[PDB]
Amino acid sequence: SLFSRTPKVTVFDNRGLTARDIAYHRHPDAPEVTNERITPHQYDARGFLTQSADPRLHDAGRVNFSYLTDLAGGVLRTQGADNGTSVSLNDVAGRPFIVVSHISATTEDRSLAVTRTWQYEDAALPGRPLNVTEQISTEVARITERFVYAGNTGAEKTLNLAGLCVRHYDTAGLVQTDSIALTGVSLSVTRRLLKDADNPDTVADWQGEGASAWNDLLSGEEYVTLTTADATGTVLTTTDAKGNIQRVRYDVAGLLSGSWLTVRDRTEQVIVKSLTYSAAGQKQREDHGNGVVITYTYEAETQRLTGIRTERPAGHASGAKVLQDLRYEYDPVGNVLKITNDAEATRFWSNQKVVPENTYTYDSLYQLVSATGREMANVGQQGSRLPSATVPFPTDSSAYTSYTRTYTYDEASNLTQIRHSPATRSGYTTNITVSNRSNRAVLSNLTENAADVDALFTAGGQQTQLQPGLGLVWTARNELLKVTPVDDSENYRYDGGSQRILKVSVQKTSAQTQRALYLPGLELRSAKNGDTETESLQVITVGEASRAQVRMLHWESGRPDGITDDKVRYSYDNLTGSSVLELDSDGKLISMEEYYPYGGTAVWTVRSAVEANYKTVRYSGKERDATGLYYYGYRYYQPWAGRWLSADPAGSVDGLNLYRMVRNNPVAWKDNDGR
Ligand SMILES: [Ca+2]
Numbered sequence: 001s002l003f004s005r006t007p008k009v010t011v012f013d014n015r016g017l018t019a020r021d022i023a024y025h026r027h028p029d030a031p032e033v034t035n036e037r038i039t040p041h042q043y044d045a046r047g048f049l050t051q052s053a054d055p056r057l058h059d060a061g062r063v064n065f066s067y068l069t070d071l072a073g074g075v076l077r078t079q080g081a082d083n084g085t086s087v088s089l090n091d092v093a094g095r096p097f098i099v100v101s102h103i104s105a106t107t108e109d110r111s112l113a114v115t116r117t118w119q120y121e122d123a124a125l126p127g128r129p130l131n132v133t134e135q136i137s138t139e140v141a142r143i144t145e146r147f148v149y150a151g152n153t154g155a156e157k158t159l160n161l162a163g164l165c166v167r168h169y170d171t172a173g174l175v176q177t178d179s180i181a182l183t184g185v186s187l188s189v190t191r192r193l194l195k196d197a198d199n200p201d202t203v204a205d206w207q208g209e210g211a212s213a214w215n216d217l218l219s220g221e222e223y224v225t226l227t228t229a230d231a232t233g234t235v236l237t238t239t240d241a242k243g244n245i246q247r248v249r250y251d252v253a254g255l256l257s258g259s260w261l262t263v264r265d266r267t268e269q270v271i272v273k274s275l276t277y278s279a280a281g282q283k284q285r286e287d288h289g290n291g292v293v294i295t296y297t298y299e300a301e302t303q304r305l306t307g308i309r310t311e312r313p314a315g316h317a318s319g320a321k322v323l324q325d326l327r328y329e330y331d332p333v334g335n336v337l338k339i340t341n342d343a344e345a346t347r348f349w350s351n352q353k354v355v356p357e358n359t360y361t362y363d364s365l366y367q368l369v370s371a372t373g374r375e376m377a378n379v380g381q382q383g384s385r386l387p388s389a390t391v392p393f394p395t396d397s398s399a400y401t402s403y404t405r406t407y408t409y410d411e412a413s414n415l416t417q418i419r420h421s422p423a424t425r426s427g428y429t430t431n432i433t434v435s436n437r438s439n440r441a442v443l444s445n446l447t448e449n450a451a452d453v454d455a456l457f458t459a460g461g462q463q464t465q466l467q468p469g470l471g472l473v474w475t476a477r478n479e480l481l482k483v484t485p486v487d488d489s490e491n492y493r494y495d496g497g498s499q500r501i502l503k504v505s506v507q508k509t510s511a512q513t514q515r516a517l518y519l520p521g522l523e524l525r526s527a528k529n530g531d532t533e534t535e536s537l538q539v540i541t542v543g544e545a546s547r548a549q550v551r552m553l554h555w556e557s558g559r560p561d562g563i564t565d566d567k568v569r570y571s572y573d574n575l576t577g578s579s580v581l582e583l584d585s586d587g588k589l590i591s592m593e594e595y596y597p598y599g600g601t602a603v604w605t606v607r608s609a610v611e612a613n614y615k616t617v618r619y620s621g622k623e624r625d626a627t628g629l630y631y632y633g634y635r636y637y638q639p640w641a642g643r644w645l646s647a648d649p650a651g652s653v654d655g656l657n658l659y660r661m662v663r664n665n666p667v668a669w670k671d672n673d674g675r
């Protein structure tokens with residue numbers, strides 16, 4: 001009835017090119033009404049795409065993208081509503097030669113334009129890249145990257161280095177590759193940072209006649225990551241920069257069967273004792289170092305994840321208990337209709353039979369239009385801040401009250417309203433104002449007028465204000481550089497591939513400071529109370545960033561009382577990889593967290609006060625910063641707004657809307673990296 005006669009339709013021109021994509025929108029609220037949505041695409045004489053537009057902007061006679069191509073189809077220019085105008089040219093060898101971006105159309109505002117260029121080896125060499133250059137506006141060009149290659153001396157061959165880049169100087173400093181396997185895996189890499197790398201004023205500029213000069217712009221400290229690998233070129237062990245060793249083992253089918261951690265100067269301990277798999281190679285039964293067992297359950301027909309059961313089993317020293325018994329009910333195409341948890345200790349849902357347990361409804365476009373859950377009664381209205389930690393664990397259904405969210409979407413799939421309706425309290429509404437000529441959008445408190453929305457973004461689609469009186473600065477490569485209030489700042493540094501290597505937070509009244517350095521399987525965290533160290537911390541992280549991760553906290557200095565050194569924190573995730581429970585090495589609950597569909601926190605409780613401040617990874621297995629943003633990798637996310645802080649750097653690959661979050665269906669799908 002709701003989904004009847006609502007196909008996806010592809011309309012061709014007379015050359016078999018897609019002139020229109022047609023979709024059929026229907027809300028369950030109004031099942032009588034069906035809104036036809038036409039996405040037109042134009043092609044030129046050759047048959048290359050020239051224009052695309054979403055239904056909302058076509059309706060208003062405007063366009064989302066214009067493309068200008070060379071005669072082979074290579075796109076020399078893109079004018080985007082969301083991400084501005086950019087010009088591109090590859091050389092005859094197919095390599096990047098020049099890209100000019102940060103340009104706005106009215107002819108063309110070129111004044112803030114970034115020009116990125118490449119320099120290769122001369123024609124008598126193979127043509128490997130030598131440097132990348134970036135020139136902004138009227139400023140002098142800066143050399144942002146350099147590459148140095150190995151020859152093929154006997155020593156180099158002995159390290160499998162011949163002709164490969166051994167020194168890559170990037171936006172954060174140097175990455176040095178000292179050894180490679182027969183199988184091609186890097187066995188020893190070494191990172192050095194720029195001098196004065198905590199200051200967002202310092203940019204990479206690799207000026208100088210040779211490596212002796214470039215190295216003089218680097219800090220002294222070396223962070224060496226070592227690796228061991230099997231005959232298939234698959235990782236067996238990793239030694240981090242502070243000497244902590246992670247080890248894994250593979251079963252007869254090549255799947256992970258066990259893992260261990262050897263903290264520097266300790267003995268090896270079991271992190272994953274055993275791990276079995278279904279016929280499809282998906283996790284079946286997982287046994288942790290803390291004796292906790294995870295049992296995964298799959299629909300036999302569709303292979304969809306039906307159950308996640310976490311428990312301390314029979315004969316466990318801390319006593320048997322089912323900590324989680326998640327069950328999922330899908331509609332035919334695999335949207336999540338219902339989530340139940342019978343292990344829930346409070347027994348909250350069988351007490352409150354007015355609103356049902358995590359029920360979800362969708363429109364014909366599989367956008368989430370309604371959701372129900374529980375929040376802690378005390379949370380109050382959602383903003384950027386995390387709720388206060390409830391300590392100790394609540395012990396009764398009074399602690400949590402039910403809620404019902406309702407979501408409203410425009411013709412271009414912008415999330416314009418999150419309406420919150422609790423059981424017995426005053427509800428609130430978050431309104432998001434969409435631009436009249438783009439998918440740029442901000443909260444109503446920033447503006448309620450469509451025509452002023454694009455002025456809160458740079459040409460490239462980067463948001464300049466996070467909240468009222470909090471300002472945002474972006475790098476030449478559209479990465480978040482700095483959050484500044486208009487007196488607590490935060491700033492960031494990235495490597496060559498836009499992956500965050502550094503985060504520094506500063507509060508000046510005396511100036512208090514915290515620093516996070518992100519390395520392979522290791523975060524070196526510190527703090528100073530005015531050039532005097534209060535805290536020094538290794539977060540050893542075991543596993544992969546898209547799976548239920550295990551963290552080990554080792555203090556070099558400044559350990560708070562109430563935390564035993566080298567305490568392991570096991571994380572336990574839901575369908576979408578959000579960190580929901582933490583257990584300790586006895587299998588006992590440390591914390592529990594639950595989420596509103598789009599990633600705001602609705603429950604946050606911890607057994608102690610001091611333990612609450614050491615869980616960074618939360619929604620989608622990603623770090624929530626003190627700003628309230630989630631760092632995904634290539635972009636930062638706003639859980640209160642249910643949308644990205646900047647335009648998709650991959651363009652229209654995932655859809656025309658460059659700010660939309662996981663096709664507006666955050667309960668099933670999960671954005672891996674923000675690209
Ligand atoms: Ca349909």
Ligand SMILES: [Cl-]
Nearest residue numbers: 321587588589
């Ligand atoms: Cl417990």
Ligand SMILES: [Cl-]
Nearest residue numbers: 596597598599
């Ligand atoms: Cl939400």
